[PDB]
């Protein structure tokens, strides 16, 4: 059973993605996920998300088998402001179905507190730019999320201001290997981080596949969250 | 903490901390040539190089059961000039017993001598082959990950960007026994990423050499070039 997509830009109107929050996509085919102001500055205390509208078969209780995953994507962020620090990040999730943004600020719109839950079933791979109390000190560092704002594993990276960043995501079924890569053209610079992940116990059967946004709680603690392309591929073996 | 680290950004003729075995050299423009370039510029069949870093590397201690994390970083060029025959055979990233000498060449790149896995090798190495032998799977290139073995633990399929630069990236993560590599190209900006599980107690010595190998067909016009440009290591026992 498989299941893909690919976006190579984006346009107002594609039926086959859900808009949340803040997120739209501009007449240029940009999917801003926080919300970005006349004047063009980022605005703060601002959440927005995207879901692809079809679900996804990551796993069979009776079959037992597993989906292995990939997904990959552009984007960018600016850090305009001089103060306060910047906030708060941008994510790539997957959990269950026709879910709705969650809290904002620090739980990037995916979670609703910073408590270990099994009850999210939810996996995610945050690129994470303001520390909370939660948080290493690093800032910007990716990080594997799952069932908890407080990644089971981080990898800082140095944010190259307003440049496009390519990631590239992947899941293993047979090692259960959740591996992410982070490449900027501009400079070159290449991060990566895996860990080992049971989606079996994790994630339910059928998924919703996503990516979101938040800016900061107080004035201009704020940066913007824009994606270029997103694709998605899940092959569960039969 | 038991640290070691180098870093070449371009090879000079007559660094010390590299030894230069088999048919590789160091070309005054600063780029290490694992395979012969005859002097019309062209890479030479049936030919096998490579280089290690004179200093070892602690990589585990059997006392207290300790292993270390590390991390290697390269960038290299591939360029098969010929339609005819099939280019061969690749180069690697190695891991192994100190003061080892070329191994057999053609497809077993100079690290292996027969495509058994046998733990006498007591080698771990991260290939990019571009022939496939019988013990390959069919598509070439393709990133691989050795254990004690030319037949690889796990592949990736990758398309080559003839004769253009690639930037690798191999990582080690002794808590989670994760061994993953990634090949950025920035001229296409193609990204390609692997990992698997990888137990270095059981696999590699105390104490070991890391190098590079290259090598060219069995056969005339079976051949590439096995350049690199620069390359660093590190490590970290605790
Ligand atoms: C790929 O294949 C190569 C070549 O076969 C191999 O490298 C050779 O390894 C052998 C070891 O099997 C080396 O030979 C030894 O050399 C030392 C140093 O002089 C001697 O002390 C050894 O003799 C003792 O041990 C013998 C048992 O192994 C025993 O029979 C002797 O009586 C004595 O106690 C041994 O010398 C040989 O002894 C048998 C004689 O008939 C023979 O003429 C004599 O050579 C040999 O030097 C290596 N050759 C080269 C060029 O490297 C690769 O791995 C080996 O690499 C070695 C450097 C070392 O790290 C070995 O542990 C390793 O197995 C093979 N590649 C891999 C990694 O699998
Ligand atoms: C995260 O916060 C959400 C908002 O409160 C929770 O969703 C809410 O779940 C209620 C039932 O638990 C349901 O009545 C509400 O309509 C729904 N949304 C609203 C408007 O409140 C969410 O709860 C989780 O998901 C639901 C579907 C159930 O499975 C709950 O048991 C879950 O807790 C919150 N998520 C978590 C894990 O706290
Ligand atoms: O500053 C960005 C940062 O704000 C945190 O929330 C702060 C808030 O900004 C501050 O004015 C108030 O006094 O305390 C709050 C924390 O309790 C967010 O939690 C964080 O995620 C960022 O958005
Ligand atoms: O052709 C490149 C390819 O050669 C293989 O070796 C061949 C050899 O080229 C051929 O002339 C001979 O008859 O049989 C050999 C075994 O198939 C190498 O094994 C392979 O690694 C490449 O180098
Ligand atoms: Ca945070
Ligand atoms: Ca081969
Ligand atoms: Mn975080
Ligand atoms: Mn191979």
Redesign the pocket.
Known sequence: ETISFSFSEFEPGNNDLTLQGAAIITQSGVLQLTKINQNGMPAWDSTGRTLYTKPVHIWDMTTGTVASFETRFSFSIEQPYTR??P??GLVFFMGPTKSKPAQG??YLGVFNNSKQDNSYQTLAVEFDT?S?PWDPPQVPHIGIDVNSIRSIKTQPFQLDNGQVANVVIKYDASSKILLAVLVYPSSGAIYTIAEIVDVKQVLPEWVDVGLSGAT???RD?AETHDVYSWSFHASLPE
């Open positions: 306060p620090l906030a708060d600020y620090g303001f909370n900061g709680a107080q603690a």
